[PDB]
């Protein structure tokens, strides 16, 4: 019966997780971590990715 409510929660929760997981995505960049790119590439090169 409470699904309607539970449903909502999950959606919201679900969204956040997706959002968080997007931080683990390259999107074409060499890496998904900014610090790694900065440490491994100079700003002229790093900025591209």
């Amino acid at each position: 019966a409470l699904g309607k409510l539970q449903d909502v929660v999950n959606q919201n929760a679900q969204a956040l997780n997706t959002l968080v997981k997007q931080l683990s995505s390259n999107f074409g960049a060499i890496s998904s971590v900014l610090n790694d790119i900065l440490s491994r590439l100079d700003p002229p090169e790093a900025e591209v990715q």
């Binding site: 100079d42 002229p44 090169e45 900025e47």
Partner: protein, 49 residues
């Protein structure tokens, strides 16, 4: 200023090198024009300039 031919590429936005790092750096948002012309007849000495 005066450089060598190989260094000509270094004179540009988003460039790295001895000249760019230590001698003359351009901003990433640089607006202007770069004009480089050989000056061998003017800047070369037989014994070494």
């Amino acid at each position: 200023f005066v450089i060598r031919g190989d260094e000509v590429r270094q004179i540009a936005p988003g460039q790295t090198g001895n000249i760019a790092d230590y001698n003359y750096k351009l901003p990433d948002d640089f607006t202007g024009c770069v004009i480089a012309w050989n000056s061998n007849n003017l800047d070369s000495k037989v014994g070494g300039n």
